[PDB]
Amino acid sequence: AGAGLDDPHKKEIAMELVSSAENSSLDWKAQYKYIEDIGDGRGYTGGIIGFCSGTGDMLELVQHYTDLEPGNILAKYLPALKKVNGSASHSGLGTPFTKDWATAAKDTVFQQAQNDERDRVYFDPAVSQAKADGLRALGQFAYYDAIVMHGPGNDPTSFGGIRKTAMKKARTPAQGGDETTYLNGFLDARKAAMLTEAAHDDTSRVDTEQRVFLKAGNLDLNPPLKWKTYGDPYVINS
């Protein structure tokens, strides 16, 4: 098609749509300064798509930030991020790290580094796989929203495992299948994945947002967009 969800304006709509489900706000950029150890064993989770000290991705994030801005105030913590990786340890981090993360969030280059990592791992793989599939922007969005909640990989509840379930039920546009048929199939598989996760939310991001755009025939994700997450309305007018 054309630029689809990669279009600057449509890419921003996509970022508010995820944020309406993630944070109940269209204000996604409010999460650059977020950081806390939620108790789940991942260590410190922060930034715009939950980077973590346990996972290896917060260390990649601030390595990216240090390549962009060598004397930034987080580079002192690189040894510590490296020791801690793979565990929920606070060793050499703790309270200075968390005061420092929030100061760094005022730097536009730290903001750009979080966006670059979001794009590297989630946005550009979901959108490119969706175009490989012959999907227009609503499909591209449905892929992105799914890799943001379920993460990369082929295990059954991660993105590639959800796409594999969908494709067992229905053929892709790239394969000769019908797009809203492939997308009801994806959505069904997504929704199933969600209810499988322990301590789940509701599934409105599919039920009263994504499926709503699909039944309207809005396959290019052109505004006005009206939807609900958790009983609350959202409108992007243009």
mmCIF file of C-alpha atoms in Angstrom:
data_model
loop_
_atom_site.group_PDB
_atom_site.id
_atom_site.type_symbol
_atom_site.label_atom_id
_atom_site.label_comp_id
_atom_site.label_asym_id
_atom_site.label_seq_id
_atom_site.Cartn_x
_atom_site.Cartn_y
_atom_site.Cartn_z
ATOM 1 C CA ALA A 1 0.000 0.000 0.000
ATOM 2 C CA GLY A 2 1.746 3.374 0.783
ATOM 3 C CA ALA A 3 3.511 4.175 4.077
ATOM 4 C CA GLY A 4 0.626 2.736 6.117
ATOM 5 C CA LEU A 5 1.336 2.961 9.829
ATOM 6 C CA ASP A 6 4.925 4.190 9.170
ATOM 7 C CA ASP A 7 3.317 7.496 8.076
ATOM 8 C CA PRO A 8 4.371 10.117 10.784
ATOM 9 C CA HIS A 9 0.735 11.087 11.536
ATOM 10 C CA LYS A 10 -0.637 7.585 11.498
ATOM 11 C CA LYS A 11 2.324 6.345 13.569
ATOM 12 C CA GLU A 12 1.277 8.875 16.234
ATOM 13 C CA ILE A 13 -2.369 7.687 16.166
ATOM 14 C CA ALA A 14 -1.038 4.187 16.664
ATOM 15 C CA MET A 15 0.948 5.465 19.714
ATOM 16 C CA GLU A 16 -2.143 7.059 21.300
ATOM 17 C CA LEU A 17 -4.260 3.865 20.614
ATOM 18 C CA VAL A 18 -1.766 1.643 22.462
ATOM 19 C CA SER A 19 -1.548 4.220 25.300
ATOM 20 C CA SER A 20 -5.361 4.327 25.678
ATOM 21 C CA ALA A 21 -5.178 0.584 26.663
ATOM 22 C CA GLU A 22 -1.835 0.648 28.440
ATOM 23 C CA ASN A 23 -2.346 3.833 30.426
ATOM 24 C CA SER A 24 -5.954 4.878 29.977
ATOM 25 C CA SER A 25 -4.651 8.138 28.447
ATOM 26 C CA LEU A 26 -3.788 9.290 24.952
ATOM 27 C CA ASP A 27 -0.707 10.932 26.541
ATOM 28 C CA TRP A 28 1.915 8.241 25.888
ATOM 29 C CA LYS A 29 4.956 10.494 26.272
ATOM 30 C CA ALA A 30 4.042 10.933 29.933
ATOM 31 C CA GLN A 31 5.726 7.517 30.567
ATOM 32 C CA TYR A 32 9.321 8.371 29.634
ATOM 33 C CA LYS A 33 9.966 9.190 33.308
ATOM 34 C CA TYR A 34 8.324 6.115 34.745
ATOM 35 C CA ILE A 35 10.398 3.571 36.631
ATOM 36 C CA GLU A 36 9.610 1.226 39.459
ATOM 37 C CA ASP A 37 10.261 -2.296 40.616
ATOM 38 C CA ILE A 38 6.770 -3.695 40.488
ATOM 39 C CA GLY A 39 7.692 -6.834 42.527
ATOM 40 C CA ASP A 40 7.308 -9.247 39.577
ATOM 41 C CA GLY A 41 10.954 -10.446 39.439
ATOM 42 C CA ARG A 42 11.972 -8.333 36.410
ATOM 43 C CA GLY A 43 13.819 -5.694 38.524
ATOM 44 C CA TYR A 44 13.196 -2.099 37.484
ATOM 45 C CA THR A 45 10.612 -1.560 34.779
ATOM 46 C CA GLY A 46 10.567 1.866 33.150
ATOM 47 C CA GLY A 47 10.188 4.103 30.093
ATOM 48 C CA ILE A 48 7.611 4.077 27.351
ATOM 49 C CA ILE A 49 7.252 0.312 26.636
ATOM 50 C CA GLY A 50 8.389 -1.156 30.000
ATOM 51 C CA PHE A 51 12.214 -1.681 29.566
ATOM 52 C CA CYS A 52 13.612 -3.807 32.484
ATOM 53 C CA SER A 53 16.862 -4.215 34.437
ATOM 54 C CA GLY A 54 16.363 -8.006 34.534
ATOM 55 C CA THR A 55 15.661 -8.486 30.809
ATOM 56 C CA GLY A 56 18.788 -7.072 29.066
ATOM 57 C CA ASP A 57 16.780 -4.318 27.282
ATOM 58 C CA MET A 58 17.237 -1.407 29.790
ATOM 59 C CA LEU A 59 21.000 -2.110 29.489
ATOM 60 C CA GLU A 60 20.629 -1.919 25.632
ATOM 61 C CA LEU A 61 18.571 1.225 25.981
ATOM 62 C CA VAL A 62 21.150 3.157 27.935
ATOM 63 C CA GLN A 63 23.974 1.755 25.822
ATOM 64 C CA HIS A 64 22.061 3.328 22.897
ATOM 65 C CA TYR A 65 21.697 6.564 24.920
ATOM 66 C CA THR A 66 25.463 6.550 25.710
ATOM 67 C CA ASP A 67 26.261 6.168 21.950
ATOM 68 C CA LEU A 68 24.005 9.152 21.258
ATOM 69 C CA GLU A 69 25.133 11.297 24.183
ATOM 70 C CA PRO A 70 28.427 10.069 25.682
ATOM 71 C CA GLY A 71 28.416 12.110 28.944
ATOM 72 C CA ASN A 72 24.727 11.555 29.762
ATOM 73 C CA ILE A 73 23.935 10.994 33.543
ATOM 74 C CA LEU A 74 23.057 7.291 33.152
ATOM 75 C CA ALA A 75 26.274 6.034 31.640
ATOM 76 C CA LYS A 76 27.906 5.680 35.100
ATOM 77 C CA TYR A 77 25.430 2.879 35.744
ATOM 78 C CA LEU A 78 26.557 0.726 32.787
ATOM 79 C CA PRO A 79 28.747 -1.656 34.959
ATOM 80 C CA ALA A 80 25.891 -2.015 37.350
ATOM 81 C CA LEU A 81 23.256 -2.652 34.614
ATOM 82 C CA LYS A 82 25.688 -5.292 33.272
ATOM 83 C CA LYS A 83 26.166 -7.115 36.639
ATOM 84 C CA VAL A 84 22.422 -7.075 37.412
ATOM 85 C CA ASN A 85 21.232 -8.370 34.062
ATOM 86 C CA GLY A 86 19.426 -11.624 34.337
ATOM 87 C CA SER A 87 18.410 -11.000 37.966
ATOM 88 C CA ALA A 88 16.086 -8.694 39.981
ATOM 89 C CA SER A 89 19.080 -7.224 41.934
ATOM 90 C CA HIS A 90 19.270 -3.480 42.759
ATOM 91 C CA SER A 91 23.040 -3.677 43.245
ATOM 92 C CA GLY A 92 24.684 -0.360 42.304
ATOM 93 C CA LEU A 93 21.375 1.074 41.252
ATOM 94 C CA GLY A 94 18.547 1.709 43.772
ATOM 95 C CA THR A 95 17.567 5.226 44.713
ATOM 96 C CA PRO A 96 20.281 7.313 42.815
ATOM 97 C CA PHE A 97 19.378 5.322 39.604
ATOM 98 C CA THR A 98 15.708 6.083 40.012
ATOM 99 C CA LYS A 99 16.278 9.813 40.712
ATOM 100 C CA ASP A 100 18.664 9.859 37.746
ATOM 101 C CA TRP A 101 16.280 8.072 35.335
ATOM 102 C CA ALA A 102 13.657 10.714 36.051
ATOM 103 C CA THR A 103 16.121 13.590 35.514
ATOM 104 C CA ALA A 104 17.279 11.959 32.248
ATOM 105 C CA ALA A 105 13.638 11.842 30.998
ATOM 106 C CA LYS A 106 13.781 15.599 30.612
ATOM 107 C CA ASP A 107 16.589 15.166 28.061
ATOM 108 C CA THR A 108 15.170 14.911 24.573
ATOM 109 C CA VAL A 109 17.970 12.582 23.511
ATOM 110 C CA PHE A 110 16.930 10.064 26.277
ATOM 111 C CA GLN A 111 13.367 10.376 24.909
ATOM 112 C CA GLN A 112 14.746 9.778 21.379
ATOM 113 C CA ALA A 113 16.721 6.711 22.671
ATOM 114 C CA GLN A 114 13.558 5.141 24.182
ATOM 115 C CA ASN A 115 11.659 5.775 20.919
ATOM 116 C CA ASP A 116 14.584 4.271 18.934
ATOM 117 C CA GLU A 117 14.465 1.125 21.061
ATOM 118 C CA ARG A 118 10.682 0.890 20.832
ATOM 119 C CA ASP A 119 11.016 1.087 17.059
ATOM 120 C CA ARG A 120 13.998 -1.303 16.773
ATOM 121 C CA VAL A 121 12.267 -4.146 18.670
ATOM 122 C CA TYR A 122 8.482 -3.622 18.399
ATOM 123 C CA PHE A 123 7.253 -1.088 15.900
ATOM 124 C CA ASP A 124 9.405 -1.829 12.864
ATOM 125 C CA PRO A 125 9.169 -5.713 13.201
ATOM 126 C CA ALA A 126 5.366 -5.706 13.667
ATOM 127 C CA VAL A 127 4.669 -3.233 10.851
ATOM 128 C CA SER A 128 7.112 -4.878 8.438
ATOM 129 C CA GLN A 129 5.714 -8.390 9.156
ATOM 130 C CA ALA A 130 2.173 -7.006 8.620
ATOM 131 C CA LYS A 131 3.109 -5.556 5.174
ATOM 132 C CA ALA A 132 4.823 -8.935 4.376
ATOM 133 C CA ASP A 133 1.371 -10.331 5.026
ATOM 134 C CA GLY A 134 -0.349 -7.842 2.671
ATOM 135 C CA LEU A 135 -2.072 -6.039 5.544
ATOM 136 C CA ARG A 136 -3.129 -2.416 5.427
ATOM 137 C CA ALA A 137 -2.766 -0.020 8.429
ATOM 138 C CA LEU A 138 -5.488 -1.539 10.684
ATOM 139 C CA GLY A 139 -3.677 -4.892 10.316
ATOM 140 C CA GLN A 140 -0.341 -3.245 10.907
ATOM 141 C CA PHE A 141 -1.743 -1.613 14.038
ATOM 142 C CA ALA A 142 -3.254 -4.929 15.287
ATOM 143 C CA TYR A 143 0.213 -6.492 14.922
ATOM 144 C CA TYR A 144 1.920 -3.634 16.835
ATOM 145 C CA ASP A 145 -0.591 -3.613 19.681
ATOM 146 C CA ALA A 146 -0.059 -7.371 19.987
ATOM 147 C CA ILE A 147 3.771 -7.303 20.096
ATOM 148 C CA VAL A 148 3.605 -4.475 22.638
ATOM 149 C CA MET A 149 1.505 -6.645 25.028
ATOM 150 C CA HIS A 150 2.786 -10.145 24.180
ATOM 151 C CA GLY A 151 6.306 -9.491 23.033
ATOM 152 C CA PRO A 152 8.454 -10.875 20.209
ATOM 153 C CA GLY A 153 8.997 -14.533 19.685
ATOM 154 C CA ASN A 154 7.288 -17.610 18.499
ATOM 155 C CA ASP A 155 6.112 -19.127 21.807
ATOM 156 C CA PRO A 156 2.235 -19.495 21.775
ATOM 157 C CA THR A 157 1.443 -16.319 23.716
ATOM 158 C CA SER A 158 3.997 -14.087 22.122
ATOM 159 C CA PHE A 159 3.399 -12.271 18.821
ATOM 160 C CA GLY A 160 4.831 -14.867 16.337
ATOM 161 C CA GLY A 161 2.884 -17.625 18.183
ATOM 162 C CA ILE A 162 -0.342 -15.530 17.868
ATOM 163 C CA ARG A 163 0.306 -14.940 14.161
ATOM 164 C CA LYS A 164 0.933 -18.727 13.769
ATOM 165 C CA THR A 165 -2.468 -19.541 15.331
ATOM 166 C CA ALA A 166 -4.175 -17.011 13.028
ATOM 167 C CA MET A 167 -2.594 -18.381 9.895
ATOM 168 C CA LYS A 168 -3.646 -21.928 10.804
ATOM 169 C CA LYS A 169 -7.251 -20.675 10.813
ATOM 170 C CA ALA A 170 -7.094 -18.266 7.847
ATOM 171 C CA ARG A 171 -4.968 -17.232 4.967
ATOM 172 C CA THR A 172 -3.243 -13.889 4.792
ATOM 173 C CA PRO A 173 -3.895 -11.302 1.943
ATOM 174 C CA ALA A 174 -0.270 -12.038 0.859
ATOM 175 C CA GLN A 175 -1.303 -15.653 0.587
ATOM 176 C CA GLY A 176 -4.571 -15.061 -1.362
ATOM 177 C CA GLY A 177 -6.926 -14.798 1.621
ATOM 178 C CA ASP A 178 -9.423 -12.144 2.566
ATOM 179 C CA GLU A 179 -8.127 -9.378 4.913
ATOM 180 C CA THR A 180 -11.099 -8.893 7.307
ATOM 181 C CA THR A 181 -11.392 -12.676 7.452
ATOM 182 C CA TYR A 182 -7.629 -12.933 8.332
ATOM 183 C CA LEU A 183 -8.040 -10.078 10.822
ATOM 184 C CA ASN A 184 -11.062 -11.522 12.652
ATOM 185 C CA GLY A 185 -8.871 -14.613 12.938
ATOM 186 C CA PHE A 186 -5.910 -12.671 14.295
ATOM 187 C CA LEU A 187 -8.129 -10.830 16.687
ATOM 188 C CA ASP A 188 -9.702 -14.018 17.917
ATOM 189 C CA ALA A 189 -6.276 -15.552 18.467
ATOM 190 C CA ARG A 190 -5.094 -12.354 20.228
ATOM 191 C CA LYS A 191 -8.062 -12.256 22.517
ATOM 192 C CA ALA A 192 -7.615 -15.911 23.332
ATOM 193 C CA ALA A 193 -3.921 -15.193 24.248
ATOM 194 C CA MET A 194 -4.939 -12.372 26.500
ATOM 195 C CA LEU A 195 -7.489 -14.457 28.518
ATOM 196 C CA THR A 196 -4.813 -17.116 28.904
ATOM 197 C CA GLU A 197 -2.551 -14.674 30.797
ATOM 198 C CA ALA A 198 -2.798 -14.898 34.535
ATOM 199 C CA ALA A 199 -4.203 -11.810 36.288
ATOM 200 C CA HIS A 200 -5.771 -10.393 33.105
ATOM 201 C CA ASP A 201 -7.435 -7.220 32.305
ATOM 202 C CA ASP A 202 -10.588 -7.187 30.210
ATOM 203 C CA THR A 203 -10.166 -7.442 26.440
ATOM 204 C CA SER A 204 -11.768 -4.177 25.331
ATOM 205 C CA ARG A 205 -8.716 -3.161 23.197
ATOM 206 C CA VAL A 206 -9.974 -5.880 20.905
ATOM 207 C CA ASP A 207 -13.709 -5.805 21.832
ATOM 208 C CA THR A 208 -14.486 -2.094 21.799
ATOM 209 C CA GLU A 209 -11.508 -0.698 19.826
ATOM 210 C CA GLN A 210 -9.889 -2.956 17.174
ATOM 211 C CA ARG A 211 -12.971 -5.093 16.244
ATOM 212 C CA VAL A 212 -14.956 -1.870 16.143
ATOM 213 C CA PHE A 213 -12.546 -0.453 13.505
ATOM 214 C CA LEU A 214 -12.812 -3.779 11.570
ATOM 215 C CA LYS A 215 -16.647 -3.924 11.457
ATOM 216 C CA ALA A 216 -16.719 -0.359 10.280
ATOM 217 C CA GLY A 217 -14.552 -1.387 7.310
ATOM 218 C CA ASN A 218 -11.848 1.113 8.490
ATOM 219 C CA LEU A 219 -8.952 -1.057 7.163
ATOM 220 C CA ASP A 220 -6.702 1.940 6.526
ATOM 221 C CA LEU A 221 -7.168 3.481 10.047
ATOM 222 C CA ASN A 222 -8.330 6.869 8.799
ATOM 223 C CA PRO A 223 -9.846 9.286 11.438
ATOM 224 C CA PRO A 224 -12.308 10.040 12.973
ATOM 225 C CA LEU A 225 -11.599 7.235 15.351
ATOM 226 C CA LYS A 226 -14.041 6.654 18.306
ATOM 227 C CA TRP A 227 -13.494 3.764 20.765
ATOM 228 C CA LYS A 228 -13.478 2.541 24.348
ATOM 229 C CA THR A 229 -11.008 0.895 26.614
ATOM 230 C CA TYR A 230 -12.385 -0.156 30.020
ATOM 231 C CA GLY A 231 -15.715 1.664 29.561
ATOM 232 C CA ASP A 232 -14.023 5.006 28.749
ATOM 233 C CA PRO A 233 -14.391 6.813 25.412
ATOM 234 C CA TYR A 234 -11.615 8.195 23.296
ATOM 235 C CA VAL A 235 -11.790 10.184 20.055
ATOM 236 C CA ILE A 236 -8.986 11.083 17.685
ATOM 237 C CA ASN A 237 -10.668 13.573 15.390
ATOM 238 C CA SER A 238 -8.043 13.880 12.727
#
